[PDB]
């Protein structure tokens, strides 16, 4: 009576949505399933209010905004926070670090070179064909050592947990990466046909001091998958004292024509083809008398569709 009644469905929807998140004792579906900078913002906002043109655009609803400036600014402030969710959604933290999660701090920019006119940016989680990945991607980031490597989380075939690395760069001084020793040489992505989309991630680790990486070094070129594979969590554990992750960029890859060339020419193995197999259908145990069941009942339990004549 005294309490107000919803006059709009939306306010009730907000109340309903809020309650769903809130815990309840009864079983529910969810269970089962600085200051100076702020002052600068106020000054900028006051300028926007004063601007007559901005008011004219708003009333005429013709205003436009440069997304590029916002995109660059977005990365600086809460990019880390949004980037963390992107990686968190894709489960990169849990698989790579065995459940450990690191917030990204240093933006990681990598773009795959296509010819010379332009180079495709490696947007987080974006799909990139292996064909374009033929050339080693250009890596751009700001640094004052560092180590950056490409990891195939689910690429590995023989062992589920194991992963394959395209290449590993160690002892990177400042921005320049040529000086840092290339422990592993680049190899084109080789996702198998029928294995589905493969998530490939790039991890950048700050290096406090130079460390011996004799184990990391691989013969150039190395064509042994067993030699190539290692555990990222184990590798981080060895150098965890002086190595801490700061940059994460990942992309999505699927089978393409270029993959066929890689498997035989240099990988020197026959390409693996995979088929999606759904669980076989369920039927009740066949009865000697299928009472009330149509004549098709027998065809359900016959494996062979061709006539058999037995002794005759």
């Amino acid at each position: 009576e005294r309490l107000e009644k919803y006059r709009s469905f939306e306010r009730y929807r907000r109340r309903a949505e809020q309650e769903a998140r809130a815990p309840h004792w009864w079983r529910t579906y969810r269970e089962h399933f600085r200051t100076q900078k702020l002052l600068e913002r106020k000054h900028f906002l006051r300028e926007l209010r004063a601007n007559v043109e901005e008011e004219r655009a708003a009333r005429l609803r013709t205003a436009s905004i440069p997304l590029e400036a916002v995109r660059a600014e977005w990365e600086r402030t809460c990019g880390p926070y949004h980037k963390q969710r992107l990686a968190e959604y894709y489960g990169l933290y849990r698989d790579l670090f065995h459940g450990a999660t690191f917030v990204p701090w240093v933006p990681l920019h990598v773009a795959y070179a296509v010819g010379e006119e332009d180079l495709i940016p490696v947007y987080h989680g974006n799909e990139v064909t292996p064909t374009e990945a033929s050339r080693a991607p250009e890596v751009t980031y700001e640094a004052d050592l560092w180590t950056l490597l490409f990891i195939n989380l689910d690429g590995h075939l023989l062992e589920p947990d194991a992963e394959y690395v395209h290449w590993l760069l160690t002892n990177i001084p400042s921005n320049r990466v040529a000086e840092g020793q290339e422990t592993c040489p680049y190899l084109p992505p080789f996702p198998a046909r029928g294995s589905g989309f493969h998530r490939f991630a790039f991890l950048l680790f700050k290096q406090d001091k130079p460390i011996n990486f004799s184990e990391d070094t691989r013969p150039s070129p190395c064509y042994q998958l067993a030699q190539r594979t290692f555990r990222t969590f184990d590798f981080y554990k060895r150098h965890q004292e002086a190595m801490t992750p700061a940059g994460l960029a990942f992309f999505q890859c699927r089978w393409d024509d270029s993959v066929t060339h890689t498997f035989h020419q240099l990988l020197d193995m026959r390409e693996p083809v995979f088929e999606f197999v759904r669980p076989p259908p369920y039927h009740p145990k066949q009865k000697r008398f299928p009472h009330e069941q149509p004549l098709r009942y027998l065809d359900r339990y016959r494996d062979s569709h061709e006539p058999t004549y037995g002794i005759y």
Binding site: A111, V114, D118, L119, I120, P121, Y123, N126, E127, V128, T129, R193, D257, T260, F263, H264, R270, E271, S304, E306
Partner: protein
């Protein structure tokens, strides 16, 4: 072996290879198999017939592709989305 398949017309061999390159073995010999019967004769018939279809489809030009299905439509959207994404 496609290279030693002199019986097949040489120009068409080029077209068949690329169109169905996936079925082509690493050595370059087309590999095709069928498993749908208990009689090798009927299974073999499938293997031979697919060769004839491949030769016929390659020799003939299907001028009209007409429309595509849902699967191809999704792929086309994916490719278009990627092209705009690579602004840099």
């Amino acid at each position: 072996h496609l290279a030693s398949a002199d019986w097949i017309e040489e120009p068409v061999r080029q077209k068949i290879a690329l169109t169905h390159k996936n079925k082509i073995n690493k050595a370059g010999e087309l590999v095709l198999t069928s498993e749908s019967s208990r009689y090798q004769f009927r299974n073999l018939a499938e293997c031979l017939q697919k060769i004839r279809d491949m030769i016929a489809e390659a020799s003939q030009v299907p001028k009209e592709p007409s429309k595509e299905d849902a699967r191809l439509q999704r792929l086309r959207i994916e490719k278009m989305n990627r092209e705009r994404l690579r602004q840099k």
